[PDB]
Design a protein around this nucleic acid. Structure first.
Lengths: 100, 53, 73, 111, 92
RNA sequence: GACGGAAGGGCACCACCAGGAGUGGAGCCUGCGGCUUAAUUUGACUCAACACGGGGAAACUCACCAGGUCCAGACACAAUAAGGAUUGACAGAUUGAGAGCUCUUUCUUGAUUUUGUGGGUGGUGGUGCAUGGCCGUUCUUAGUUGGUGGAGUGAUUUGUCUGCUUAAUUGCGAUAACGAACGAGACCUUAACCUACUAAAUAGUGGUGCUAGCAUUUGCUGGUUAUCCACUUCUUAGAGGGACUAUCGGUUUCAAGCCGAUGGAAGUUUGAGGCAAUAACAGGUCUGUGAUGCCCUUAGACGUUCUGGGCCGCACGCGCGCUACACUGACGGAGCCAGCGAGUCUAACCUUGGCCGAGAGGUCUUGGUAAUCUUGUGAAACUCCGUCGUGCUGGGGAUAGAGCAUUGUAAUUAUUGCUCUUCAACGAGGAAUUCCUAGUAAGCGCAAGUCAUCAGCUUGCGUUGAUUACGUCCCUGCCCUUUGUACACAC
């Protein structure tokens, strides 16, 4: 009943195939929807000195994390959303569903 | 006695400690990961913090 | 450090190691009859008359209540 | 509830904590690797290990203790956290397992 | 040490009920969850139990994980005088 | 092999050549040396220490200096030892101390218990002239090593090299070498082209009713969110395709290559990075840790803590730095810009609002787990009109004082932000030295890091944006070859 399924993972291929198979399931089961809305890749930059001590040249490195976010809105029945939650589940992608 | 720890530690590096080696100095607090910098260097390879640039 | 004389006086003040004294706590002697009570105890409702009242000098103090007790019995 | 960035950073730090625990104690039980399966109200964690029959314990007691530790730590209902143990072919494809093997060999006293 | 038998038995009964004791290496706080006794007393008692040899210790980022032993659970059981197969900490 | 004030060849704006910005000179925030007491805790001292220990520290961080407890001998035994230990309790003398650790004394759960016998725990006590790991450096150059074969008695040598190009033992090629490996290159992220393929009530493009204004006459701005549509031309993910010197002209046993004309996106690998071979330094690191070999405390300990301080102390010398030494100005009023990035669940961040005010200050939820909100981040120099005009002066902002409040229960050796003030050195700085070939030197700023409070620092991003260079081995460095050597911890 007016729910939103979003995916906030960092495994890009798992996210891609999850979105693909979810789209295929929705189209083959004839549920009208708009395409997966895709958010800008959020980059987390954390800069750290290499040396544990204070010595050496003032060298630096930047550890980076990437985040890809997708979301789709579903208006689908209770039994079918139970089916979608319990099946077509693919690990590696942190997928959560809220309402409105 | 009840005055063993009277002096507060609600701010400063008295509170902030590393979650791996209990470091107080060099504690990078960002994103709420609460580990020291060298521990972050060591554990980035295994956690999934990967160097590209 | 390795060069320290600690000019403050020697303070070897190890507490008493329970010097073995004689027996104590004589209330009263009532031979061949009903036994009475002495050494006035606490009357606090939570106590069951087990608190040795702090009869120091014209002043008492309770044991069950660890913080506040102002009486003069 | 809380922010997704902090959420996945805690995911990483919990992964690091569990990997450190496993490599600290399950090492002599031939521990090689772990992967976390996230499911609604379920946390499946997989372990491909070399000495599976001796890491298992007599009737799953050690696996029960590993489970119920994190269960009581994060107030999980029993069964919600579940860890599975398998054995992978070609045990030489495990740098950590070989590391712990010759690590024990040194404390044994081999050349 | 001088540490109450009440919370000594409290720690022992938690040991029996769960089979593992979690203790963050955060002493000098004296406020454990669900227990009003000193957490440093709790940790010292559990560590003494380990030294006398009935429970194994792990640090794991200063978190004092503990785990009962084949003889440790038996010793606690025999102290508590519980019927056979009543409620072991590693049951399922 | 090393070195040569030995030769040849090939390279480098951590080198120069023509320059630009500079610093060194002034003030003032930072670190080191020296000076000081009880201390001003230590690491390191050319590149490769000196805004570096992510060290922007008020009372932990605090490793140092004054004072104040328990001793945690975890684990068993010899001796007091329920005719009862052991810590622990209310008051004046003592101590900031309402911590009996003691002086006039009255005890509630209580055999873990006092010395030693053995052994343990902690340590930001050392040792990096014991380590691991992480670095930095050798080394931003291209070098390194087997198998087999050849050479020499042997250490070893060839392979791994004449000549040409490249950034490159990159290759062409010659050839007692053939066959392999690593490094390099390949490799991956970032930025630059598509008006094309799948997708955007977290926004618009294009049409109407609510529309209001300029206005009446035929155009522009926006809001009206179950108020009706096609798409992404502006915020985006992807087999995505594409620069491989593509085509052509010149030089080269015209082989590899180099210099020129261009639609095409760039024709110096299209740029900027990560990772980066073999060997080594006695280079940093025991101050990142319940990591250690060897010495230190084992009980008036260096073991965890409390109140004050201290690392900010200043006669002096140095090191990135910010503002400067005025007219391209200083100040005053009007017109507008994006990006890296962060932001509150068992706690309270970023703060959108009405208001009381010169400013800084003071309220309840509406906004936000974050393409929706903070944030068109309306930022800074920047464009138009204005005052002053060469006086150390309206330039320069600092050394003094007076005030107003969020921080911290605690500012004080101004923490901080505003108003008045002060008007100090400084008139572009000697010898001497740092960055630089494109959106880059530089000038302006913004977000994050350490944030209770505090950036003049760092990590990145964005705006405005230049003449300079297409060469060299002259100074300083790198590699290779030849060569000399009485060097070999190696000039």
């Amino acid at each position: 009943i007016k729910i939103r399924i979003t995916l906030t993972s960092t495994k890009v291929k798992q996210l891609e195939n999850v979105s693909s198979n979810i789209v295929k399931n929705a189209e083959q089961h004839n549920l009208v929807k708009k395409g997966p809305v895709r958010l800008p890749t959020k980059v987390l930059k954390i800069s750290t000195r290499k040396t544990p001590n204070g010595e050496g040249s003032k060298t630096w490195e930047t550890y980076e994390m990437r985040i890809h976010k997708r979301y789709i809105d579903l208006e689908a029945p209770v039994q079918i959303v139970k089916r979608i939650t319990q099946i077509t589940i693919e690990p590696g992608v942190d997928v959560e569903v809220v309402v409105a | 006695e009840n005055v063993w720890f009277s002096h507060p530690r609600r701010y400063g590096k008295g509170s902030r400690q590393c979650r791996v080696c209990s470091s107080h100095t060099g504690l990078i607090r960002k994103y709420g990961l609460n580990i020291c910098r060298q521990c972050f260097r060591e554990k980035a390879n295994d956690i999934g913090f990967n160097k590209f640039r | 450090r390795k060069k320290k004389v600690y000019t403050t006086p020697k303070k070897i003040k190890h507490k008493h190691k329970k010097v073995k004294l004689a027996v104590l706590s004589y209330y009263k002697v009532d031979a061949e009859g009903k036994v009475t009570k002495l050494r006035r105890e606490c009357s606090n409702p939570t106590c069951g008359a087990g608190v040795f009242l702090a009869n120091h000098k014209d002043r008492l103090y309770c044991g069950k209540c660890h913080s506040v007790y102002k009486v003069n019995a | 509830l809380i922010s997704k960035k902090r959420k996945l950073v805690a995911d990483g730090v919990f992964y690091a904590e569990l990997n450190e625990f496993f490599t600290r104690e399950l090492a002599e039980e031939g521990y090689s690797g772990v992967e976390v399966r996230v499911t609604p109200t379920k946390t499946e964690v997989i372990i491909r290990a070399t000495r599976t029959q001796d890491v298992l314990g007599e009737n799953g007691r050690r696996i029960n203790e590993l489970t119920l530790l994190v269960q009581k730590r994060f107030k999980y209902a029993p069964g919600t956290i579940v860890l599975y143990a398998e054995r992978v072919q070609d045990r030489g494809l495990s740098a950590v397992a070989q590391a712990e093997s010759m690590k024990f060999k040194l404390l044994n006293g081999l050349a | 040490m001088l540490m109450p038998k009440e919370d000594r038995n409290k720690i022992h009964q938690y040991l029996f009920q769960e089979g593992v004791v979690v203790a963050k290496k955060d002493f000098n706080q004296a406020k454990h969850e669900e227990i009003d006794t000193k957490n440093l007393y709790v940790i010292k008692a559990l560590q003494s139990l380990t030294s006398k040899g009935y429970v194994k210790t792990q640090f794991s980022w200063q978190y004092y994980y503990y785990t009962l032993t084949e003889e440790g659970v038996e010793y606690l059981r025999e102290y508590l005088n519980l019927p056979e197969h009543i409620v072991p900490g590693t049951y399922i």
